[PDB]
């Protein structure tokens, strides 16, 4: 139905010929879906795959080889024809690890992003219906909503199609619709229609966009359009815009690369500069700018080989990999920097209601007044069976099960139950269980109302759907509703304005029907109700009231109650406004105390678990929530919050008693306190602002409305799955399986995730600086080249690709979990773990050019024996004092060099291994906890087998076959940085800080 919005309520319903409080017939929606079909989106595209692998070419450290790449492609057509073959390959060197490492890349994203999409899709989103099928509201699947039923939605919704607003069953509509329009602050809706057909969409006061959010209050429309008809279906085929961002964590290492970038550029002029005397030899031959062209290949060969590729991949693989991690633990991660933040994180905020509790709602206890005396006072407490919400109880007074109707104060109380309530509920056919429509508080009024069946009404004979609502439904047609205040957190009540049907209660008048917390509800009690009779509200009997609320609050079962009473004189109708809420409470002024009702929320099975495991982590759990301090306090305690018997008087607030406190008391509370309750959604944020004072990473877990500012002002915002629409929104992670110990994995994972960035740098630097330092010392020295461009090439494929990257594979240390947060003010290398870098840097260097210098002097086997004359090489063809008559060109020779590359390949394979913690030993961190590194190794170490032995290849890399002796002459040299770096290890965690 094309503008909808021209069209008033009365011209909607008769556009598709539908009852507005009945609904569509089970023949009208058959039609309808056959007209309108299912309202759904093709889901839109996908990531490609082409340009999945594109985006592993955007980085500047790949872009670099990327240049390079190019320019000795470019320089191959310079060279002689003599020797050709060597040339070629260099570029294809360069390449090939570029690709290594995309591959790994697109192939991780491509796992992380179908686990996401099997957690997205595995939960089918719901809505509220009216249909001619069952009398009250169903829940039906949102893609087998059509045009033309109505469709009810309350606070926490998530609107599923176009829908025009045919009533507001509330004072106020508030829509969140940012995600379309654009404006951040919720808009108001109405019901009168827009005579505009033109008009935007921001016009459109009495339309509800499909992915928008309600704010505040509750409505009833008829849907407008469906699927890719809605307005926001119009731009999801489009107008893709995606909302990708590099993380915190990303960028941070990002700076590091430029940082990396420019002193790699310096240290590489540093080696074209100090070996222009060598442009002029007789070695290369050449004039003295041909001589100048390899050393410049000298310098981007070595830039090559010091330049980090998987840097930028292996980031973007351990996030993706961190993120499939969740998925199967059914969290779906909305924002990247999710997991990165949880490791960081000191303190998590959470919710009590919904959140710490398993949101299973059921009434087990009430009482009313009994008798009155001057100083006594005495209640009729009954006992309710039954955990779930299937109508199926008993009401028991003194272990017997009693007719409710018996008792007149019963009466009065199901009667507030039934009325004051915007919740119902609705029976599952296919899993054979009844659900809550609405708030689990509520819903437990009504399952409460469903087994104090009051008027004795016939529900023997009725289907299981037809006896979800039966006893509600009579008391709805006692009294009609004229309106009703919404329930709101600062008055902490909800009320409802009721006149008679004009049968049997028509010679009483107009009634209020006020549900909400103790505390206020009573405190607004003139009087209490005996019976049917009235006596003045006394101290004895307000006493005794608050008494039996405390004993069921703080008891074994930790109940959440609330107060019921009614105003037995409400104000003129028309003496009161429903424009301000604020208005409210004075309108549920000088009530009468009917009765309390308290029900079980049983906490998740988990939580306590994860809050010691946090604990040992070092992370406080703080509980802030709306209900009872009582409650809040004896729930702590049974979560592991609190000790049994620890004094909490200085770990406990109310939002009164925090309010009392003077700012800066304010703060120092909220590091000190643990519990608040009976708290306002400004309370919520504002203590999570507290705690970011102290620049402490907070995290916010919550479920309602009340806890989206929190949500949003923390660090990471984690929602519950079975939580609000607003919440989810207002979140960076959705726990989809209510599981709270996933948040502790999180950490964990965030926590790994960094550690692994840690030993990837750890090694990368630690073996490419021994590579620059190897190069410098010959030149010091004096002794001859080590490696030529195309040797510097081959180092950087085997040594910075795969076992490299596999790094990121890396299992978590034995104290991950056992260890204080890191601090946001701690830099990202330490000044002790650069000097590890120089300390490793410094042997591997040394030693591959010791090795280069055995073959030289100390080779017995070896072809060439000679003492100190490596120093001065290159006089022996102008003057020989001491040599002892050899070749001239014996320091030409490939096998020293062969030596050299040997060992600087095998020496970093064994520097790998070392990276497997950052100060646990490798006898305690075993060499075989990470298997795809092994594999990465002997890949790496077996292709460089194939380099020396495989015919065509030793000629082309400029390399000879060594001895089963030089063999054993390079693990001599290599194996011993096993050693070093585990002394290394040994220092840091005993004679340091572990
Ligand atoms: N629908 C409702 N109608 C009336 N009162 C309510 C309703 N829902 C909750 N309350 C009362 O208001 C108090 C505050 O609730 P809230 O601030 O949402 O967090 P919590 O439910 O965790 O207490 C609750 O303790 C409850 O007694
Ligand atoms: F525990 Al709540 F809102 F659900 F404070
Ligand atoms: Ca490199
Ligand atoms: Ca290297
Ligand atoms: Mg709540
Ligand atoms: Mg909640």
Same mark, same amino acid.
């Given at each position: 139905?094309?503008?909808?919005?021209?069209?008033?309520?009365?011209?909607?319903?008769? #556009?598709?010929?539908?009852?507005?409080?009945?609904?569509? @017939?089970?023949?009208?929606?058959?039609?309808?879906?056959?007209?309108?079909?299912?309202?759904?989106?093709?889901?839109?595209?996908?990531?490609?795959?082409?340009?999945?692998?594109?985006?592993?070419?955007?980085?500047?450290?790949?872009?670099?080889?990327?240049?390079?790449?190019?320019?000795?492609?470019?320089?191959?057509?310079?060279?002689?024809?003599?020797?050709?073959?060597?040339?070629?390959?260099?570029?294809?060197?360069?390449?090939?690890?570029?690709?290594?490492?995309?591959?790994?890349?697109?192939?991780?994203?491509?796992?992380?992003?179908?686990?996401?999409?099997?957690?997205?899709?595995?939960?089918?989103?719901?809505?509220?219906?009216?249909?001619?099928?069952?009398?009250?509201?169903?829940?039906?699947?949102?893609?087998?909503?059509?045009?033309?039923?109505?469709?009810?939605?309350?606070? /926490?919704?998530?609107?599923?199609?176009?829908?025009?607003?045919?009533?507001?069953?509330?004072?106020?509509?508030?829509?969140?619709?940012?995600?379309?329009?654009?404006?951040?602050?919720?808009?108001?809706?109405?019901?009168?229609?827009?005579?505009?057909?033109?008009?935007?969409?921001?016009?459109?006061?009495?339309?509800?966009?499909?992915?928008?959010?309600?704010?505040?209050?509750?409505?009833?429309?008829?849907?407008?359009?469906?699927?890719?008809?809605?307005?926001?279906?119009?731009?999801?085929?489009?107008?893709?815009?995606?909302?990708?961002?590099?993380?915190?964590?990303?960028?941070?290492? *990002?700076?590091?690369?430029?940082?990396?970038?420019?002193?790699?550029?310096?240290?590489?002029?540093?080696?074209?500069?100090?070996?222009?005397?060598?442009?002029?030899?007789?070695?290369?031959?050449?004039?003295?700018?041909?001589?100048?062209? #390899?050393?410049?290949?000298?310098?981007?060969?070595?830039?090559?080989?010091?330049?980090?590729? /998987?840097?930028?991949?292996?980031?973007?693989?351990?996030?993706?990999?961190?993120?499939?991690?969740?998925?199967?633990? +059914?969290?779906?991660?909305?924002?990247?920097?999710?997991?990165?933040?949880?490791?960081?994180?000191?303190?998590?905020?959470?919710?009590? @209601?919904?959140?710490?509790?398993?949101?299973?709602?059921?009434?087990?206890?009430?009482?009313?007044?009994?008798?009155?005396?001057?100083?006594?006072?005495?209640?009729?407490?009954?006992?309710?069976?039954?955990?779930? #919400?299937?109508?199926?109880?008993?009401?028991?007074?003194?272990?017997?099960?009693?007719?409710?109707?018996?008792?007149?104060?019963?009466?009065?109380?199901?009667?507030?139950?039934?009325?004051? +309530?915007?919740?119902?509920?609705?029976?599952? =056919?296919?899993?054979?269980?009844?659900?809550?429509?609405? =708030?689990?508080?509520? @819903?437990?009024?009504?399952?409460?109302?469903?087994?104090?069946?009051?008027?004795?009404?016939?529900?023997?004979?009725?289907?299981?759907?037809?006896?979800?609502?039966?006893?509600?439904?009579?008391?709805?047609?006692?009294?009609?509703?004229?309106?009703?205040?919404?329930?709101?957190?600062?008055?902490?009540?909800?009320?409802?304005?009721?006149?008679?049907?004009?049968?049997?209660?028509?010679?009483?008048?107009?009634? %209020?029907?006020?549900?909400?917390?103790?505390?206020?509800?009573?405190?607004?009690?003139?009087?209490?109700?005996?019976?049917?009779?009235?006596?003045?509200?006394?101290?004895?009997?307000?006493?005794?009231?608050?008494?039996?609320?405390?004993?069921?609050?703080?008891?074994?079962?930790?109940?959440?109650?609330?107060?019921?009473?009614?105003?037995?004189?409400?104000?003129?109708?028309?003496?009161?406004?429903?424009?301000?809420?604020?208005?409210?409470?004075?309108?549920?002024?000088?009530?009468?105390?009917?009765?309390?009702?308290?029900?079980?929320?049983?906490?998740?099975?988990?939580? %306590?678990?994860?809050?010691?495991?946090?604990?040992?982590?070092?992370?406080?759990?703080?509980?802030?929530?709306?209900?009872?301090?009582?409650?809040?306090?004896?729930?702590?305690?049974?979560?592991?919050?609190?000790?049994?018997?620890?004094?909490?008087?200085?770990?406990?607030?109310? /939002?009164?008693?925090?309010?009392?406190?003077?700012?800066?008391?304010?703060?120092?509370?909220?590091?000190?306190?643990?519990?608040?309750?009976?708290?306002?959604?400004?309370?919520?944020?504002?203590?999570?602002?507290?705690?970011?004072?102290?620049? =402490?990473?907070?995290?916010?877990?919550?479920? /309602?409305?009340?806890?989206?500012?929190?949500?949003?002002?923390?660090?990471?915002?984690?929602?519950?799955?079975?939580?609000?629409?607003?919440?989810?929104?207002?979140?960076?992670?959705?726990?989809? *399986?209510?599981?709270?110990?996933?948040?502790?994995?999180?950490?964990?994972?965030?926590?790994?995730?960094?550690?692994?960035?840690?030993?990837?740098?750890?090694?990368?630097?630690?073996?490419?600086?021994?590579?620059?330092?190897?190069?410098?010392?010959?030149?010091?020295?004096?002794?001859?080249?080590?490696?030529?461009?195309?040797?510097?090439?081959?180092?950087?494929?085997?040594?910075?690709?795969?076992?490299?990257?596999?790094?990121?594979?890396?299992?978590?240390?034995?104290?991950? %979990?056992?260890?204080?947060?890191?601090?946001?003010?701690?830099?990202?290398?330490?000044?002790?773990?650069?000097?590890?870098?120089?300390?490793?840097?410094?042997?591997?260097?040394?030693?591959?050019?010791?090795?280069?210098?055995?073959?030289? %002097?100390?080779?017995?086997?070896?072809?060439?024996?000679?003492?100190?004359?490596?120093?001065?090489?290159?006089?022996?063809?102008?003057?020989?004092?001491?040599?002892?008559?050899?070749?001239?060109?014996?320091?030409?020779?490939?096998?020293?060099?062969?030596?050299?590359?040997?060992?600087?390949?095998?020496?970093?394979?064994?520097?790998?291994?070392?990276?497997?913690?950052?100060?646990?030993?490798?006898?305690?961190?075993?060499?075989?906890?990470?298997?795809?590194?092994?594999?990465?190794?002997?890949?790496?170490?077996?292709?460089?087998?194939?380099?020396?032995?495989?015919?065509?290849?030793?000629?082309?890399?400029?390399?000879?076959?060594?001895?089963?002796?030089?063999?054993?002459?390079?693990?001599?040299?290599?194996?011993?940085?096993?050693?070093?770096?585990?002394?290394?290890?040994?220092?840091?965690?005993?004679?340091?800080?572990?």
């Amino acid at each position: 139905m094309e503008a909808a919005h021209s069209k008033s309520t009365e011209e909607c319903l008769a #556009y598709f010929g539908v009852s507005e409080t009945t609904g569509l @017939t089970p023949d009208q929606v058959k039609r309808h879906l056959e007209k309108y079909g299912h309202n759904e989106l093709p889901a839109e595209e996908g990531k490609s795959l082409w340009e999945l692998v594109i985006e592993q070419f955007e980085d500047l450290l790949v872009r670099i080889l990327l240049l390079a790449a190019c320019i000795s492609f470019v320089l191959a057509w310079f060279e002689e024809g003599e020797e050709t073959i060597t040339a070629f390959v260099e570029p294809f060197v360069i390449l090939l690890i570029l690709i290594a490492n995309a591959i790994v890349g697109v192939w991780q994203e491509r796992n992380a992003e179908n686990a996401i999409e099997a957690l997205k899709e595995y939960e089918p989103e719901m809505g509220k219906v009216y249909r001619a099928d069952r009398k009250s509201v169903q829940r039906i699947k949102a893609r087998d909503i059509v045009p033309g039923d109505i469709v009810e939605v309350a606070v /926490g919704d998530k609107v599923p199609a176009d829908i025009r607003i045919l009533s507001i069953k509330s004072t106020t509509l508030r829509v969140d619709q940012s995600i379309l329009t654009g404006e951040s602050v919720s808009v108001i809706k109405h019901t009168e229609p827009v005579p505009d057909p033109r008009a935007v969409n921001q016009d459109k006061k009495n339309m509800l966009f499909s992915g928008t959010n309600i704010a505040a209050g509750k409505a009833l429309g008829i849907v407008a359009t469906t699927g890719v008809s809605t307005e926001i279906g119009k731009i999801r085929d489009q107008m893709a815009a995606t909302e990708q961002d590099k993380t915190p964590l990303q960028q941070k290492l *990002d700076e590091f690369g430029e940082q990396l970038s420019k002193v790699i550029s310096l240290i590489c002029v540093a080696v074209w500069l100090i070996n222009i005397g060598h442009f002029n030899d007789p070695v290369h031959g050449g004039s003295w700018i041909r001589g100048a062209i #390899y050393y410049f290949k000298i310098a981007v060969a070595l830039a090559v080989a010091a330049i980090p590729e /998987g840097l930028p991949a292996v980031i973007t693989t351990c996030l993706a990999l961190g993120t499939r991690r969740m998925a199967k633990k +059914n969290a779906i991660v909305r924002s990247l920097p999710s997991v990165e933040t949880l490791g960081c994180t000191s303190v998590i905020c959470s919710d009590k @209601t919904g959140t710490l509790t398993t949101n299973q709602m059921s009434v087990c206890k009430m009482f009313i007044i009994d008798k009155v005396d001057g100083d006594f006072c005495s209640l009729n407490e009954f006992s309710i069976t039954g955990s779930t #919400y299937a109508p199926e109880g008993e009401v028991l007074k003194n272990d017997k099960p009693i007719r409710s109707g018996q008792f007149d104060g019963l009466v009065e109380l199901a009667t507030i139950c039934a009325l004051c +309530n915007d919740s119902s509920l609705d029976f599952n =056919e296919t899993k054979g269980v009844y659900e809550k429509v609405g =708030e689990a508080t509520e @819903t437990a009024l009504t399952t409460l109302v469903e087994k104090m069946n009051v008027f004795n009404t016939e529900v023997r004979n009725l289907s299981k759907v037809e006896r979800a609502n039966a006893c509600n439904s009579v008391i709805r047609q006692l009294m009609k509703k004229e309106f009703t205040l919404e329930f709101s957190r600062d008055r902490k009540s909800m009320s409802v304005y009721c006149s008679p049907a004009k049968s049997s209660r028509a010679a009483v008048g107009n009634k %209020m029907f006020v549900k909400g917390a103790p505390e206020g509800v009573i405190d607004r009690c003139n009087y209490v109700r005996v019976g049917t009779t009235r006596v003045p509200m006394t101290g004895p009997v307000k006493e005794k009231i608050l008494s039996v609320i405390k004993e069921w609050g703080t008891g074994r079962d930790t109940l959440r109650c609330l107060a019921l009473a009614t105003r037995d004189t409400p104000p003129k109708r028309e003496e009161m406004v429903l424009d301000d809420s604020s208005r409210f409470m004075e309108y549920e002024t000088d009530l009468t105390f009917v009765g309390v009702v308290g029900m079980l929320d049983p906490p998740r099975k988990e939580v %306590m678990g994860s809050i010691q495991l946090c604990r040992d982590a070092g992370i406080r759990v703080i509980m802030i929530t709306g209900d009872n301090k009582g409650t809040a306090i004896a729930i702590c305690r049974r979560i592991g919050i609190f000790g049994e018997n620890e004094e909490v008087a200085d770990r406990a607030y109310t /939002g009164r008693e925090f309010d009392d406190l003077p700012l800066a008391e304010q703060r120092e509370a909220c590091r000190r306190a643990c519990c608040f309750a009976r708290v306002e959604p400004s309370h919520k944020s504002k203590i999570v602002e507290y705690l970011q004072s102290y620049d =402490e990473i907070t995290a916010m877990t919550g479920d /309602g409305v009340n806890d989206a500012p929190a949500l949003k002002k923390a660090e990471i915002g984690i929602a519950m799955g079975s939580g609000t629409a607003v919440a989810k929104t207002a979140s960076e992670m959705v726990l989809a *399986d209510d599981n709270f110990s996933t948040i502790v994995a999180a950490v964990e994972e965030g926590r790994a995730i960094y550690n692994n960035m840690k030993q990837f740098i750890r090694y990368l630097i630690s073996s490419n600086v021994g590579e620059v330092v190897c190069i410098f010392l010959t030149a010091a020295l004096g002794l001859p080249e080590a490696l030529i461009p195309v040797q510097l090439l081959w180092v950087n494929l085997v040594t910075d690709g795969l076992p490299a990257t596999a790094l990121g594979f890396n299992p978590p240390d034995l104290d991950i %979990m056992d260890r204080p947060p890191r601090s946001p003010k701690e830099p990202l290398i330490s000044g002790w773990l650069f000097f590890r870098y120089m300390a490793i840097g410094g042997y591997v260097g040394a030693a591959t050019v010791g090795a280069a210098a055995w073959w030289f %002097m100390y080779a017995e086997d070896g072809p060439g024996v000679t003492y100190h004359q490596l120093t001065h090489f290159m006089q022996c063809t102008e003057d020989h004092p001491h040599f002892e008559g050899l070749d001239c060109e014996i320091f030409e020779a490939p096998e020293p060099m062969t030596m050299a590359l040997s060992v600087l390949v095998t020496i970093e394979m064994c520097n790998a291994l070392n990276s497997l913690s950052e100060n646990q030993s490798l006898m305690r961190m075993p060499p075989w906890v990470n298997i795809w590194l092994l594999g990465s190794i002997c890949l790496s170490m077996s292709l460089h087998f194939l380099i020396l032995y495989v015919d065509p290849l030793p000629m082309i890399f400029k390399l000879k076959a060594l001895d089963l002796t030089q063999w054993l002459m390079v693990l001599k040299i290599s194996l011993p940085v096993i050693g070093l770096d585990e002394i290394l290890k040994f220092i840091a965690r005993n004679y340091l800080e572990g």
